[PDB]
Structures are given as C-alpha cells and as structure tokens.
Design a protein around this ligand. Structure first.
Ligand SMILES: [Cl-]
Ligand code: NA
Lengths: 465, 352
C-alpha cells in the first residue's frame, strides 16, 4: 500500500504533539477524517472527539493525500507539512421566529454581546442575566419586536399612529439592555427606551426622533458607551448622531412631518454627503471610537474622522459595496474589513492602503452580499448573509490562489459551512430558488447564543451547534 | 475581442419583482437609480426598492385599462413618474423614502405650473389622494412615451392614431402640440436626441430624423425591417439600435449610411424592446418574445475614422414564455451594468 510522508504542526496551544510523534508515514489515500482520527487517538493527542482540519501551504485539505500530490504535480516522496486546526462546530437549525412580513434586521442582547458589555458598566443600564437573552427583530411592516430565546414575543413597538415608525424599518440595534435604535424608509432614526416587567411582558417607548437624511436610512451602527449612532443612507450621506437627549441638537425643520416648503425631534451631530451613490454601510472602528468606515454603491470604502467630518482616506474597489464589517485582531490597532459586494463576493481590505491591491476574496454566494458578522469566538472567521437565501461561514486561515476565472489576482477563500434557509431546506427539493425568490437573507448576527438570520421568508432563523 | 476582455456585463438573475396580476408591460428605473417603476395588465403602476424587490407604492389608474408604459421625468430634482393607460397620460409623485417635504413641494410645483390635441386636467379626488396630479387625454391609445432630457417636454405615440399619432407635450405650458402631421406610414414609437434639438419618429419601416427649432426633417433611416418594434439612441447621438418583429437587431451609424452598419439575428421570435446604457458603459440589450434578453458590448470609438465595435456577450434566460409572449420591455441602471426586464409572465427581473 502506498505511503505519504507527513509532518504535523499546530498553533493550538493545548494540542502540541511530542517531537518524536510529529513526523509520520500515513496511507497515501488517507483523508481529513482518517488524519483527524490519528491525532485524536491515545498514542497521539488523546483528545478522542475533536474534529480537525488540515492546512497545507495555506489551504485546507479537502482530498486524499495521494490526490493532493497529483493535483499539485508533486513527487510521491514529497513530504507534506500539515498544520492541524480545530474545525468549526456545525451550527445546525434550531428554531424560527415567525413574522407576518419581511424581516429587515436582527440583533442580539446577551451578556457577551456589544450591548451586554456596554450594559455591564451598569451605568443606568442593568446587566444582562444569563438565560435572559433577548433577540431584536425589525420588519418591513414598520414594527420592532423583542423575543426571548425560546421564541415568544415579549414586546412590540407602537405603530405610526402612536409615535412609532411610519414606514418599513430597514435597520435596528440594541445600545444597551434598555436602549435601542432603529431606522428606515421614513428617513428617521428612532431611539427607544425598553422596559420589562414579568419576564414575558415589555414596553418600547420612543425617546428621540432623529431627522437629517433625505432618503431611506438603510444601515446603522451603535456605540452604547458614548451613546452614539452612525447611519448610511440612500441619499449617499453618512450620519453621526447622539442617542441621548442631553446632546442631540435641534432638527432641520424642513425635514419634519407636516413641514411647509410627543417625542423630542432632533438633528445629527454631523451629516456628510461623501458618496456619489447610495451609502450602504457605516461602522465604528472597534478599537478607536472617534473613527468610522463607510461603504457605498460608488465602489468606495472611506475612512472618516468623527471629530471633524473629514474623509481621511478613500479606497476604490472594483464593485458596488453593500455591506461592511470590522474584524478585531490581537496585536493590531487597525481592523481588517470585510466588504460584501453586489457582485456576489466579499472583499477583505485594510482601510489604510492604496486602492491597487497594496488582497483576498471570499467566493461562494450566488447573489448580493448584504450582511456580515464577525465570529465572537475568534478573529479569523465570520458569517455573511446574502440575497441567495444562505448564510455562509468563512475561515480566513484558508486561502488558495485565484483561478483565471476569478481574475487570477489575489487569494480566494471558500466557505467552511453553508447555512441554508430552513423554510426551503425542509421542502426536500434539490433545486435552490432562483434570484432569492421568497428567501433572501437581509440580516445576520453571530452571538455566543448562536447565529440569527432574518429575511424575506418572514422568519428569524436560529442556527447553533 | 472575447467576452472575457469585455467585462463588466450582467450575467445572472438576482431579484424578482412579484405582485402584478397578468403581464408586466413596462419597466423604468428612476433617475437616481434606487427605485423601479412597473406598469401592468392589471392597470396598476408599482414602484419598488430596486435591489430587494420590495413593492413600496402602487396605484390603480384605471380598472379597465392596461398600463402600457411608464417613464420617469429624467431630472433628479423631482420625483415625477409618467404612465400611459388607454387614452391618458398620468403624471404622479409616488410615495417613496426619497420624497422629502421639499422634494414633494418641488415636484408638485413643476406639475401645477401650467394652471382637442391634448386635454390637460386634474385626475379627480381618488387619484389626487394617491399622488396623481395631472391627467392628459389624447385621441388614440398611447403605446410609447419619451421624455426630453431637460424634463419640460415629453412625446407620446399612438399607433392607431392615424393623424394625431405623435404628440409633443410641454409640461410648463400644459400644452399639447401635434406637429409632424407630414408622415409616410404608421407610427410605432419616438425619441428625443440626447445632445441636440432633434426628434426621431419610427414608422413601421423607417425612422425619420427631424429638427425641432428649425422645422421638419434632416434625415431618413432605413433599417430594412418589415416591421419596427423599437429603437433607442446612443448617448453619443450618432448611432441607433433598432429592434423588429422580424427578429432582427440593427445598428445604425447615422453618419456613415442610412441603412444598417451591422445586422444581428439571435432571437427565434420577435424583438419587443431595445436599450442603450446611458451612463457611459459600452453596453446595450434587446428583449425578445422567445423569453430572452441578449446583451451586447457596443463601443463607439473616440476616433471618428474608426467604426463601432459590436460584440454579443451574454444571453439572459429566466423569464417564462406565456402564450407566445416573453420579454416586453427593458431598462438599464443609470450607472451600473445592471438591467431590469418586464415579463409577460407577470414578473419584472433584475440582472447583474
Ligand atoms: Cl413586495
Ligand atoms: Na437556502
């Protein structure tokens, strides 16, 4: 039987092999499974049940070792170095929160979520108790809803007749355990106080109506510590807002309902028309809250100085961008951004670079990529939400060269897992829906609690190990 | 030149617009590129969020009449949509996130500024409530609408009109004139010129090019088709693409000759619509009753002495052929290599 020379190596701190064990002969036809079983065995790592993947020259093994050597035109006596890593636990389907209309946005309140941590300050916001996590959904019907994890609605925002949104909501987030922000087609951002009584009953009351945008407000990011909000609008502008009455300035009267050309109505701290096409995303720098990044259908990622409104830097990518997310990396002040495009791929960028590559592409979605959420567990993975009806999980540790079909420039990373729309998967059909028909994903968030995704099938879907 | 070297161009279906009952007759993307307008057999005009397929606004103009065409006033400082059903042209301000109090006010002003060839009237309480401000009535059913680029004039064409078939309407004056009563045959559709005071009128077998400030006729065009269905004018102003029921697509270089510079036959059934990209991309498309759109690269060189480079790059399939009708109308995004199509199957579709 044919053999292959293998050297094992790893970056997992707890899983180092003793030196005499690292170099080994294995059957040439062994695959990931067999290699994984070897590491778990008693004579090796003795971990028993840990699924491993293997990096060879920077990309995951997905074949037998014999085939890897064949496909790369290597000698039979080639020694392969296999960097083993812990693989992602599959996030399988758990539950659906049924809605009457399309779900445009989802967010999660847990002790470890951003709003939970901002609440842990305990500075007028109560800490999130374990077991009492909350899920926020926003709908095209114009209403916000708060769910417990078991899937009961605890609270629903008031209608347009009672101080609520007067048109479809496009975006929403928790600032803290008792404060939320939302935005949509009525050109407003609303700030809400949330109170809960007997754990199954709650109330959302508007505290601010924020005016400034002259088109749909399609995306929002929040900072619950400083009580600030960033918006991106179809008007091509980036908005910067205080979420507190003590700091929100007076509004442009010409934008108010009833204007001829009771919640407090206020304007922005800043409103900057920096994009020549719809602005689609705006986020705080995770490490420096005076810095923001925006993305737009005009193909650019811009870096903003929030103290001045100045565009500090402009990257021009090759396609319209529909989404932006920051990855936080140990040892580095500058994030790595994921930018989801209208051309179905995701581009990874360092916002402090020249436009011309100064490059990694995430390929696999069959439609627009409109939502992104970094893994809460580490710094090399994230989940994307797409109008193709899927959410895809990516591992950036794995990158292969691009093929000519992919422009032959840069590295390409493929998904490690695909989360199907359960409403379609439970049909037991092989034909996926074309053009996201009835199943577009509009929003995904990845919490320790799980991966939550909402869209056109009118459900928040819950996936987790 | 291979299609590889000719990127970008649309290749896949990405959004479907569902809601019309019966055929979708017309599609038009707004001047800012965020909203789609559609017209239907069901007599509704619908406005949609372009990327998601969300219907955001609709109105039923007339219960008994199909909306044959929808076309936006091509100015970004207003939000005005024109729609033809039977004998009438309706001008309206759809309810849309971009319509601020100021933008609404501006738009109302443009429409009200004006306050039998054409009868200009307010459309009545029910329609006024929904944001329809003008109703213009002509003699014969409109099958085509074309705006002048500055938004003060729009032309309507009525095939069975006989001799008030082509009308030109001045919005500011609430005035419908019917010049060009001189003509060879039956009028199909018309269009203003992107850069000059010219006006094109397509008969069943020729396209007559005219002059507006002077008076009448500077050029004929001879596609050589048995029956013209549609045409469109390149943004440069020197070239035309012409579709026909005869299943042939023609490119006319207006300078070089009055007969086709290039002839393309790719469709097994009638061509119903053609359209140039207007934003600078060297693209155009046609739409056929075989249920497909063909996309072409069409590049007009800077050097006059050289000839246009025309290359087919993609066939877009996805629409359903229903009782021998397929794709009825097409439009391009103002800036991106994206197009929308209207289907006999009751859908519009976005391609990217
Ligand atoms: Cl809809
Ligand atoms: Na799916």
């Amino acid at each position: 039987v044919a053999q292959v020379k293998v050297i094992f190596t790893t970056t997992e701190p707890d899983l180092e092999l003793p030196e005499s064990k690292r170099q080994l002969l294995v059957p040439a036809d062994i695959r990931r499974y067999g290699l994984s079983r070897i590491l778990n065995s008693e004579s090796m790592l003795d971990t028993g049940s840990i699924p491993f993947d293997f990096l060879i020259n920077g990309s995951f093994l997905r074949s037998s070792l014999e085939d890897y050597l064949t496909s790369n035109g290597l000698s039979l006596e080639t020694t392969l170095t296999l960097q083993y890593v812990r693989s992602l636990i599959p996030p399988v389907y758990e539950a659906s929160f049924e809605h009457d209309d399309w779900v445009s946005a989802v967010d999660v309140l847990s002790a470890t979520s951003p709003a939970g941590r901002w609440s842990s300050a305990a500075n007028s916001s109560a800490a999130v108790q374990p077991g009492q996590e909350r899920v926020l959904s926003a709908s095209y019907d114009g209403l916000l809803r708060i769910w417990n994890a078991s899937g009961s609605v605890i609270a629903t925002s008031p209608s347009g007749s009672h101080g609520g949104h007067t048109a479809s909501i496009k975006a929403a987030k928790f600032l803290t355990s008792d404060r939320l922000a939302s935005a949509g087609m009525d050109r407003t951002v609303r700030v809400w106080k949330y109170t809960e009584s007997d754990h199954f009953t709650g109330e959302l009351k508007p505290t601010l109506e924020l005016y400034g945008h002259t088109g749909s407000v399609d995306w929002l990011d929040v900072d619950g510590h400083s009580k600030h909000i960033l918006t991106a609008s179809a008007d091509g502008a980036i908005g910067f807002w205080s979420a507190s009455k003590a700091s929100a300035p007076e509004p442009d009267a010409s934008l108010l309902p009833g204007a001829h050309v009771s919640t407090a109505q206020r304007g922005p701290l800043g409103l900057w028309s920096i994009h020549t096409a719809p602005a689609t995303a705006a986020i705080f720098d995770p490490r420096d809250r005076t810095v923001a990044y925006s993305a737009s259908q005009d193909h650019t990622v811009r870096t903003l100085d929030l103290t001045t409104g100045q565009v500090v830097s402009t990257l021009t990518l090759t396609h319209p961008l529909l989404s932006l997310s920051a990855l936080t990396r140990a040892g580095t002040t500058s994030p790595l951004l994921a930018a989801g495009t209208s051309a179905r791929h995701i581009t990874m960028v360092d916002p402090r670079a020249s436009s011309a590559t100064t490059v990694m592409t995430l390929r696999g979605h069959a439609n627009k990529v409109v939502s992104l959420s970094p893994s809460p567990e580490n710094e090399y993975s994230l989940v994307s939400g797409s109008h193709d009806g899927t959410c895809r999980v990516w591992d950036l540790r794995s990158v292969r060269p691009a093929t000519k079909e992919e422009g032959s420039l840069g590295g390409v990373s493929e998904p490690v897992y695909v989360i199907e729309r359960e409403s379609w998967a439970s049909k037991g059909k092989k034909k996926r829906p074309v053009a996201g028909d009835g199943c577009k994903v509009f929003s995904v968030v990845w919490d320790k609690l799980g991966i939550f995704s909402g869209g056109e099938d009118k459900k928040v879907q819950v996936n987790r190990g | 030149p291979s299609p590889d070297e000719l990127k970008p161009f649309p290749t896949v279906q990405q959004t479907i617009f569902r809601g019309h009952e019966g055929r979708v007759r017309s599609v038009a993307i707004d001047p800012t590129g965020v909203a789609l307008a559609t017209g239907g057999d069901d007599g509704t005009v619908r406005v949609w969020e372009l990327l998601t397929g969300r219907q955001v606004w609709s109105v039923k103009l007339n219960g008994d009449e199909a909306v044959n065409t929808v076309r936006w006033r091509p100015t970004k400082d207003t939000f005005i949509l024109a729609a033809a059903a039977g004998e009438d042209i309706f001008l309206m301000i759809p309810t849309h996130p971009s319509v601020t109090p100021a933008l609404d006010q501006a738009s109302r002003d443009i429409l009200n500024a004006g306050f039998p060839p054409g009868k200009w009237a307010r459309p009545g309480t029910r329609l006024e409530d929904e944001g329809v401000l003008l109703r213009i009535t002509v003699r014969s059913t409109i099958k085509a609408i074309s705006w002048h680029r500055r938004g003060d004039h729009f032309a309507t064409v009525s095939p069975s009109g006989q001799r008030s078939s082509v009308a030109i309407h001045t919005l500011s004056k609430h005035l419908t004139q019917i010049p060009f009563r001189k003509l060879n045959g039956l009028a199909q559709t018309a269009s203003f010129h992107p850069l000059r005071p010219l006006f094109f009128v397509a008969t069943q077998r020729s396209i007559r090019c005219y002059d507006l400030q002077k008076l009448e006729l500077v050029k004929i065009v001879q596609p050589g088709a048995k029956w013209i269905s549609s045409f469109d004018v390149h943004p440069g102003g020197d070239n035309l693409v012409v579709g026909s029921y005869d299943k042939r697509l023609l490119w006319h270089d207006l300078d070089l000759s009055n007969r086709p510079y290039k002839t393309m036959r790719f469709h097994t059934e009638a061509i119903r619509a053609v359209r140039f990209h207007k934003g600078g991309l060297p693209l155009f498309a046609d739409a056929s009753d075989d249920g497909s759109l063909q996309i072409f690269h069409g590049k007009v060189p800077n050097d006059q002495l050289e000839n246009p480079t025309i290359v087919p790059v993609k066939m877009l399939k996805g629409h359903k052929v229903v009782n021998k009708l397929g794709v009825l109308d097409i439009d391009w995004h103002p800036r991106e290599p994206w197009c929308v199509s209207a289907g006999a199957d009751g859908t519009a579709r976005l391609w990217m």
